[PDB]
Amino acid sequence: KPFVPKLVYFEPEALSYPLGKELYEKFTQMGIKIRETTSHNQVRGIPGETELARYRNAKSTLVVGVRRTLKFDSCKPSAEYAIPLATGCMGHCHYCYLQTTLGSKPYIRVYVNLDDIFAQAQKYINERAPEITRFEAAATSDIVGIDHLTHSLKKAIEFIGATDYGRLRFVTKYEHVDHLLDARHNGKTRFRFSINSRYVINHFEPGTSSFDGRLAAARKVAGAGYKLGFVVAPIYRHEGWERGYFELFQELARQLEGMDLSDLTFELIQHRFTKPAKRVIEQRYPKTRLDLDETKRKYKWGRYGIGKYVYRDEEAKELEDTMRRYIEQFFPGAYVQYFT
Numbered sequence: 001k002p003f004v005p006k007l008v009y010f011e012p013e014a015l016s017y018p019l020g021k022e023l024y025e026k027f028t029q030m031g032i033k034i035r036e037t038t039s040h041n042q043v044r045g046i047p048g049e050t051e052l053a054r055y056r057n058a059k060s061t062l063v064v065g066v067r068r069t070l071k072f073d074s075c076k077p078s079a080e081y082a083i084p085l086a087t088g089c090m091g092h093c094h095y096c097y098l099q100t101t102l103g104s105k106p107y108i109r110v111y112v113n114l115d116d117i118f119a120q121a122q123k124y125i126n127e128r129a130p131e132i133t134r135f136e137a138a139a140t141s142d143i144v145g146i147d148h149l150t151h152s153l154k155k156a157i158e159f160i161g162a163t164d165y166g167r168l169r170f171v172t173k174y175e176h177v178d179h180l181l182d183a184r185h186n187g188k189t190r191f192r193f194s195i196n197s198r199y200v201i202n203h204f205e206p207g208t209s210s211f212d213g214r215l216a217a218a219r220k221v222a223g224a225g226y227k228l229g230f231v232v233a234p235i236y237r238h239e240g241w242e243r244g245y246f247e248l249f250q251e252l253a254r255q256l257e258g259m260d261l262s263d264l265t266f267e268l269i270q271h272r273f274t275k276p277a278k279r280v281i282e283q284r285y286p287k288t289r290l291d292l293d294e295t296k297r298k299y300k301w302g303r304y305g306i307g308k309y310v311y312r313d314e315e316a317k318e319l320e321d322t323m324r325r326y327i328e329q330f331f332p333g334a335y336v337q338y339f340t
């Protein structure tokens with residue numbers, strides 16, 4: 001049930017680092033097919049005759065490379081920066097925004113040069129101290145879902161835990177958190193889970209852990225002293241969404257009752273999609289119920305890239321107000337960090 005790749009690519013340079021060496025040893029011992037690639041951003045020969053086949057097979061492919069981009073991207077409103085530990089995901093969420101993100105790849109990538117990466121993170125922290133600098137580790141991947149293979153996130157958690165002015169956060173749809181429970185987080189990591197209505201999870205989130213699985217994991221990480229949070233996203237106006245999301249927060253409260261929820265956080269993100277979304281999603285998920293009708297949406301223009309469709313202002317406000325009402329009803333004193 002925890003993710004294991006069926007095909008693994010290595011950059012030759014990756015073997016020079018401890019994680020690369022360790023993964024090569026692990027995967028050869030398991031007898032898994034291993035290939036070489038010059039760059040992790042140009043992987044050749046992933047099997048499949050159709051686009052759909054190559055896409056599905058890429059989602060079962062792990063690529064082990066070196067992070068050569070010095071700059072960390074900003075990650076507002078979640079955090080100051082995205083810390084780059086991995087890219088890609090084994091999940092098959094129909095709506096996933098990563099599908100149409102510039103330069104995104106369908107395969108799962110992990111970076112081995114953690115010394116370089118954490119040193120750069122410390123540099124950003126130093127540049128802003130004594131202000132707090134937050135790092136998002138799950139901006140372009142499900143870092144938690146991959147981590148049982150690498151422990152890169154566990155190392156990041158403990159790196160940030162040792163800093164004075166650094167904070168870490170990440171969000172997951174996976175329950176495989178056991179190895180992270182004894183990590184020395186030192187109160188400086190916010191462990192979040194993506195949750196949604198029964199409609200959205202059942203119809204649009206195949207290849208992820210169940211709602212009960214995500215909540216079991218949430219109880220574990222809270223019990224281990226992590227700061228707990230939830231990301232309600234994508235907020236999607238399906239038939240009967242009002243009651244659907246009411247029952248989400250009601251069930252969420254029942255599954256967390258007894259626990260201290262004085263520092264619990266919520267983040268709210270409405271469903272958004274880009275212009276190329278329809279063609280990409282229809283090819284990859286032919287039977288999807290996902291509504292990508294742009295005529296009923298408002299378009300936000302891009303800045304340096306292309307923009308995105310979101311719900312019209314009045315629909316978005318309706319969503320925000322309704323979610324805020326439910327959170328106030330079932331989780332008094334929980335902080336809503338933002339709606340976007």
Ligand SMILES: C[Se@@+](CC[C@H](N)C(=O)O)C[C@H]1O[C@@H](n2cnc3c(N)ncnc32)[C@H](O)[C@@H]1O
Pocket residue numbers: 089095096097098138139140141142143171172173193194195231232233234235269270271272273
């Ligand atoms: C990019 Se997701 C990476 C982290 C992890 N693998 C996870 O799924 O939680 C980050 C969040 O953004 C949501 N999200 C994904 N696509 C969309 C979208 N199109 N519109 C609106 N929201 C979208 C997902 O449900 C997540 O809550």
Ligand code: SF4
Pocket residue numbers: 088089090091092093096097098141142173208
């Ligand atoms: S899990 Fe997070 S990342 Fe993996 S697919 Fe579903 S959304 Fe995209």
